[PDB]
Structure 1
């Protein structure tokens, strides 16, 4: 199972949850999260944050009665994965190759938006410095 293309695997998605806080008795059990495409991205801050393997929308603020499907459609209506209804081994390689192609795109988008924000930041920072020489 080619490790680069593994996140299409719900069990792999489940395995990503290292010490995911919410378990039985909760509605966003990590199964329900992986079922929604999310994977665990624990950090120093917000160790509750997960990311959709396909659209890459990141999401925290998780409470036990949050429906990870409902939060995925809400914060990332454009996610193509949400539309996948068949199981993985049930996709034709035509469909699957279209997904991984779209997903790689979604990944460039995340990177592009990110470089752009990092740029505007250093942009804002330099004009402030220049403005200060007017004074």
Structure 2
């Protein structure tokens, strides 16, 4: 085994996350193919087919059977290093592997940051409106 933080680098681990996935034999986006593309299954009450790239953290829902997960990952996050990684896990050098984990860490932060921004912007609008409402009354 490997530390939990690193398991997602492994196809077999990612495939294991797709339990309860509806798109199985006959479909283009099987868990094998989803896993090959970098995805983890992260289902919610609201979107129960929600998947996340483990590396760049793009989230995608609304899957259909004919969908090729690589072509979609490419469409919705063309900046994802993992799509450039040609070698298998065991064929990576530790330097290479450590370089990738750093990038993934940067990606994660980027996603957290951009979230906080969107949330902060949302609160700003609320607060601004509220104070306009207070001017408006007189």
Q: TM-score, normalised by structure 1?
A: 0.99
Alpha-carbon distance in 1 for matches of 2:135, 2:126: 15
The unaligned stretches of length 5 or more in structure 2 are: none
Q: 1:10-65 CA distances to partner (integer Å, 9 max, x unpaired)?
A: 00000011200100000000100000000000100110110000000000110010
Over the residues paired in the alignment, what is the CA RMSD in angstroms?
0.5
Q: Report the count of equivalent residues.
A: 135
The structure having more radius of gyration, on CA atoms, is: 2
Q: 1:60-110 CA distances to partner (integer Å, 9 max, x unpaired)?
A: 110010000000011000000000001000000111000000000000000
The unaligned stretches of length 5 or more in structure 1 are: none
List structure 1 runs of 4+ shifted beyond 6 angstroms.
Answer: none
